């Protein structure tokens, strides 16, 4: 069940200076990078272009190049319209893409956040605010909905291009998405808290438990998943024990890559 995400972040410091950067994720793997500095979208994977011809890609990027410039001016001209109600710094974030399903089914989203709160979305054929949004957004929404040219484009982007493009992506990138990478684990302790360190595994699903023989220690706390640079994960479980109980404790690690060879690590 893969989720394709085009994340855009834009900052407007004052009336003049502004910048826009973007990344693109398929599941948890970055496929693209678009720095404000660059005039072109970067592939961060040999199969980033999915299954579009050279001519389809170049046309796609040209649409984006134009959008990025237009988005900048348009925001700046919305501040002008809304003022003195709203003012710089302004931070806009876009989250757009589609989620792919069994068979040939999908769902597309285009979500906008302003100063960190989700406020606007494309839905159906128009822009609309969401529950919780300030009422003043109604004018920007009305101005944006006046532009039929953008509406139909965006409808085409979400309805057809995303699902189509991404399908191409999952074909071309099967060996990376289906990569298996074994974890590695090491024990350690702190004033007493014992720590099982699991690092280098892919994909993300993983099972880690502290155990006295067979009894799974109910006090195990899993930490968050932290990323490594090389597109693998890192996680740790802590068990709180009273000093002198460390004898005969073990860490058991399960992960698809190990192929039923659970990692066993005794204290």
């Amino acid at each position: 069940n893969y989720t394709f995400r085009c994340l855009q972040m834009s900052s407007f410091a004052n009336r003049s200076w502004s910048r826009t950067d973007s990344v693109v994720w398929l599941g948890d793997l970055q496929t693209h990078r678009w720095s404000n500095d660059s005039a072109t979208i970067s592939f961060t994977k040999p199969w980033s272009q999915g299954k579009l011809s050279n001519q389809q890609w170049e046309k796609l990027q040209h649409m984006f190049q134009v959008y990025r410039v237009s988005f900048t001016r348009d925001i700046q001209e919305l501040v002008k319209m809304m003022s003195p109600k709203e003012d710089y710094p302004i931070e806009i974030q876009l989250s757009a893409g589609c989620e792919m399903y069994p068979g040939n089914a999908s769902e597309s989203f285009l979500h906008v956040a302003f100063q960190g709160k989700y406020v606007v979305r494309f839905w159906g054929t128009s822009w609309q605010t969401v529950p919780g949004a300030p009422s003043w957004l109604d004018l920007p929404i009305k101005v944006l909905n006046a532009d039929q040219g953008t509406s139909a484009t965006v409808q085409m982007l979400l309805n057809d291009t995303c699902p189509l493009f991404v399908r191409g992506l999952l074909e071309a990138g099967k060996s990376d998405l289906e990569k298996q990478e074994k974890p590695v684990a090491w024990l350690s302790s702190v004033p007493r808290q014992l720590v099982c360190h699991v690092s280098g595994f892919y994909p993300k699903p993983v099972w880690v438990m502290w155990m006295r023989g067979d009894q799974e220690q109910q006090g195990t706390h899993r930490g968050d998943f932290l990323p490594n640079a090389d597109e693998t994960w890192y996680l740790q479980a802590t068990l709180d024990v009273e000093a002198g109980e460390e004898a005969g404790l073990a860490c058991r690690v399960k992960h698809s890559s190990l192929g039923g060879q659970d990692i066993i690590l005794y204290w």
Partner: T-cell receptor
Amino acid sequence: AAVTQSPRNKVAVTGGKVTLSCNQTNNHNNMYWYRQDTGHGLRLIHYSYGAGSTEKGDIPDGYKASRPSQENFSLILELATPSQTSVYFCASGDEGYTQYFGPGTRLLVLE
Amino acid sequence: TQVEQSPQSLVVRQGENCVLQCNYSVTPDNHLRWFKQDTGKGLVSLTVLVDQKDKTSNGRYSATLDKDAKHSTLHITATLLDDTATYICVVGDRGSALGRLHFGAGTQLIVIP
């Protein structure tokens, strides 16, 4: 959707203050002032998005806008100059693209 | 200078046809509009072309737009004396009031009675 300008024609002297005014009855948030000089297309001087707001256009120097009300947009020449001689156009619109243009105003500035 | 018109000026006899060019580099190019401006008067809109490849007509006036070529023409059929005027090309970079208009300098048409 009609838009008027006053005066339609004005002779003025260097140093003098001149005001050009635009009345628009269609309830339009947005108004614009242009100047047309032979051999150039119209150029944007100032614009406005609503009562109280005024905005710098492409060639704003020497000019000051005033949007007191939804109906009025004035272009003020605080110190008229030979070079401010031109035909001056005003326009309004809503949130759609079309702008509705005034009939124009010939200004002459003599030394 | 992103909107250029051609010819600068032309003289035609009443009844003959003529074609006016407009080439631009505005980006993006939502729509293109043709104005007619009598000497002294102001701007009367003749047509507005909106599609990638668009064609329009309005009386004896007709007009094409090729967005790919970023090029437009205004055809006047059977010119009359009242056609004597300046023809202005205008490109609009948005489909909403967020856009700016980009005016060409015009093409001067004189029609011999």
